[PDB]
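Dear Dr. L.,

I hope this message finds you well. Following up on our conversation about the binding site, I have prepared a predicted three-dimensional model of the protein together with sodium ion. For your records, I am including the exact sequence and ligand specification that went into the calculation, followed by the structure tokens. Please feel free to forward this to your student if that is useful.
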Amino acid sequence: SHMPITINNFNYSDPVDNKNILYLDTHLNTLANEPEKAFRITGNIWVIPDRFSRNSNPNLNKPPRVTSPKSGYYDPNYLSTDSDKDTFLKEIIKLFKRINSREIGEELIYRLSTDIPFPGNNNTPINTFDFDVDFNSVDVKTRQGNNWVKTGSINPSVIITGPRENIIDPETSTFKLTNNTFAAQEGFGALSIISISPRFMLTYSNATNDVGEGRFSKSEFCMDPILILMHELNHAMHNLYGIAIPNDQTISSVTSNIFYSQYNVKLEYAEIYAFGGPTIDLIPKSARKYFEEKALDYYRSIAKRLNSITTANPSSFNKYIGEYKQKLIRKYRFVVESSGEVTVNRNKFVELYNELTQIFTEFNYAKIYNVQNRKIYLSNVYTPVTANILDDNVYDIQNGFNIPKSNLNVLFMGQNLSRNPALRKVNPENML
Ligand SMILES: [Ca+2]
Ligand code: NA
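The resulting structure of the complex is given below.
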């Protein structure tokens, strides 16, 4: 993470500086009627503290019908006020600082904020770098009179936004034009948008760390907000490096929550990798190998493109083709022959692929950050809880909820619902 990562600090009210604070138009948020104020966390990672939706005629109100069994929490007013956005913004910032407190987290942030999606998709000519492909380029706008006019654009690799309709259903996605295929699943990679609210914590009893309650009554624990966020950052990693597995690749399983006893769910392989651990073995070995080989082929195709670039879009990028060729070579860890030809080194690929799918995983983070966490992705869940994580007496960068000062550092008591009064169940009125 070669040059030490530092997280920027912001107040939602801080003025636009045309550098780290700008108004953007992603052309993707159906809830947005005008440009959205955005803040640069670090490098190419931005945050827009607004609710986000992809549904036409979006509605954030609690649904009358009850699809489910998936647990849901709805509040049409969450993040509606600037005061709300300021708190959300500061929460995301604080979580990034905590993530950045451990080596693996610093590297995770370094990669997501430094490496970029290959500029192009399946339909990009072999000799072209297209920095405007699909939704990779976001418009920068400024108010002129009573209107908003485009003054330029930026290429974020990851944009964090507030939740979509279901506040307790974090969602990471990439986007494409109708006639294209997902570049995130084809080696190129693409811009990711993560809609989430880490302070709304999932609760569970089937945990990774034994706290000696097996023969008695097991306590309910909350997920540390950084793992909820890091789980999605893992999806962003897969998307950035173009190794995302299509969501139609699933394994039929079961799980349960507060309102519904054991029910069926199509567990996505994408989620299995984001979680990590032994769970990865749920994916047939032959299938795991298939996706890895498919990725390698897409990588070989990328190297081929790099040996053919002669033009760029927009034209202003033509003079920087060499610079970006070099950046992409470093991203994919390709090798440059004495002849200057770019080639793929399988040993390097295998190492990278393994890092992206088995080291940068929620399961691994739980151990590294020494926090209690669900034992499996489908651990049964209870009523979600929340807390004032900006209050260092409740949650700090070094120990999260397990603060020694509060005497909550033993057996993950800070995460134990029955031992930490700072943890409170979310409004039952908004649950579904
Ligand atoms: Ca664009
Ligand atoms: Na999700």
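In brief: The chain has one domain: 1-432.

With kind regards,
A. P.
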